[PDB]
Design goal:
The complex is a heterotrimer of chains A (about 220), B (about 90) and C (about 45).
Chain A lengths: L2 H10 L9 H18 L4 H11 L6 H9 L9 H13 L4 H13 L8 H4 L2 H5 L8 H11 L7 H14 L3 H13 L20 H9 L3
Helix pairs in contact in A: 1-2, 1-3, 3-4, 3-5, 4-6, 6-9, 9-11, 10-11
Chain B lengths: L1 H22 L10 H14 L6 E2 L6 H9 L3 E3 L6 E4 L5
Antiparallel strand pairs in B: 1-3, 2-3
Chain C lengths: L1 H23 L7 H7 L9
Classes of the chains: A mainly alpha (about 220), B mainly alpha (about 90), C mainly alpha (about 45).
Chain lengths: ~220, ~90, ~45
C-alpha cells in the first residue's frame, strides 16, 4: 500500500465494531488524510471516494465534517464525483450542517472541477433546494456561478419571485434575481459578495493553483 | 424538430412509467395506478386551461394524492378540498 | 396546434419526473438508466 491508500481502504470498509482501540485507529487514518490534503492535496480518485463516503450515512457527523474540510484537490475534481455527491444529497440521510458544508465546498472548489456541463444538468436539483431556508444563501451563491442562459426558465423565475416575496429582498436572492434579469429581461425586470463565503479550504498550494488559474 | 421532441417525449414517458411502477406501487374499492392519475391531471391541465381541477374520487389512493401534494406536483383548490390541479410547469 | 402543446406537455413531464425522483429519495446515480435519464432532464424542449 502507501500511507494514504490504507486510510482510503479503512474508510471504504465503513464503520467497524465497538471501540477498544478503534477511536485511535480512525483518528490516525483521518489525520493521515488531512495531512496529505493540507500538504500537497488529494488526487481525483481519492476525492471521488472520500467525498461520497462522507456524504453517505456511514460514519458520524464529526468524521464527515473533517473529511469535507479536508477535500482539497491536488489537480482537479471529477464532475462524476460531484454528480454522485448530488445523488447522495438527494438520498436524504445526510446531516444539514453537512449539506451546508458541501454547498460551501462546491462554491469554493468551483474552478477546480474539470467539466461543469453535467453539473449544470443538475440545475433542477440545485434549484429545488431553495425551499430550505438553511441552505438558501449557499444554494443561491452556487446558482449564481452555475446559471447559464438556458437555465432561466419561466417557472423558475416565477418561483424565485415568490420566494423573494416570502423572504424579502435578501442579498443572495437579489443577486440571483439580477442574474436572471440579465439573462431574460422579458420574463422579469430585476456577483458578488455573499455572506459566509469564507474559503475554509484555502491552503497555500490551493492558493497558488487559484492564482495560476488566472492567465 | 418535431420528431426529435416526439422521440424525447416518448422516451421520457416510458422511463417515467417504469420508474413509477418500480418505486410507487399499489398496495396489492378499485384503485387506479399513479400513472393513470398523472395522466388525468396532465390531460385536464391542457384540455381545460381555465379549470384544470379534477375531483378526488375513491379510486385515488390518498397516499398518492399526498405524495403529489408534498412534492409540488399537485395543488389544492383554495376552497374545494375534493379538487386538485396540476402545477403548470410550462408557465 | 400539435407542436407547441407537445412542447408544453414535455416540459410538464420533465418537471413531474424530476419532482418524483426527488421525492422518492432514490440514489439515482446507482441506477445506470436512472442516472443517464436524470441528465436528460433540464433540456429546453423549444430547442
Amino acid at each position: 500500500m502507501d500511507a494514504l491508500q490504507m486510510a482510503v481502504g479503512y474508510f471504504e470498509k465503513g464503520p467497524i465494531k465497538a471501540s477498544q482501540n478503534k477511536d485511535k485507529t480512525l483518528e490516525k487514518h483521518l489525520k493521515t488524510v488531512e495531512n496529505v490534503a493540507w500538504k500537497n492535496g488529494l488526487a481525483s480518485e481519492e476525492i471521488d471516494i472520500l467525498l461520497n463516503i462522507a456524504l453517505s450515512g456511514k460514519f458520524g457527523n464529526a468524521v464527515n465534517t473533517r473529511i469535507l474540510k479536508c477535500m482539497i484537490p491536488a489537480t482537479v475534481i471529477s464532475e462524476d464525483s460531484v454528480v454522485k455527491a448530488v445523488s447522495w444529497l438527494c438520498v436524504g440521510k445526510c446531516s444539514g450542517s453537512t449539506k451546508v458544508l458541501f454547498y460551501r465546498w462546491l462554491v469554493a472548489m468551483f474552478d477546480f472541477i474539470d467539466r461543469k456541463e453535467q453539473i449544470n444538468l443538475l440545475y433542477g436539483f440545485f434549484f429545488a433546494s431553495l425551499q430550505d431556508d438553511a441552505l438558501c444563501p449557499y444554494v443561491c451563491h452556487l446558482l449564481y456561478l452555475l446559471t447559464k442562459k438556458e437555465n432561466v426558465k419561466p417557472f423558475r423565475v416565477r418561483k424565485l419571485l415568490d420566494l423573494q416575496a416570502k423572504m424579502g429582498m435578501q442579498p443572495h436572492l437579489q443577486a440571483l434575481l439580477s442574474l436572471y434579469k440579465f439573462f431574460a429581461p422579458a420574463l422579469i425586470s430585476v456577483k458578488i459578495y455573499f455572506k459566509n463565503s469564507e474559503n475554509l479550504w484555502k491552503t497555500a498550494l490551493l492558493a497558488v493553483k487559484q492564482r495560476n488559474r488566472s492567465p | 424538430k418535431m420528431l426529435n421532441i416526439k422521440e424525447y417525449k416518448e422516451k421520457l414517458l416510458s422511463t417515467l412509467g417504469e420508474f413509477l411502477e418500480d418505486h410507487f406501487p399499489l398496495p396489492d374499492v378499485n384503485l387506479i395506478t399513479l400513472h393513470e392519475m398523472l395522466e388525468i391531471l396532465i390531460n385536464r391541465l391542457f384540455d381545460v386551461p381555465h379549470d384544470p381541477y379534477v375531483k378526488i374520487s375513491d379510486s385515488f389512493w390518498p397516499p398518492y394524492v399526498e405524495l403529489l401534494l408534498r412534492n409540488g406536483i399537485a395543488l389544492r383548490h383554495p376552497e374545494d378540498p375534493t379538487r386538485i390541479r396540476l402545477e403548470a410547469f410550462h408557465q | 396546434q400539435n407542436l407547441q402543446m407537445e412542447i408544453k406537455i414535455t416540459t410538464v413531464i420533465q418537471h413531474v419526473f424530476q419532482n418524483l425522483i426527488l421525492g422518492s429519495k432514490v440514489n439515482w446515480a446507482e441506477d445506470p438508466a436512472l442516472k443517464e435519464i436524470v441528465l436528460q432532464l433540464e433540456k429546453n424542449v423549444d430547442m
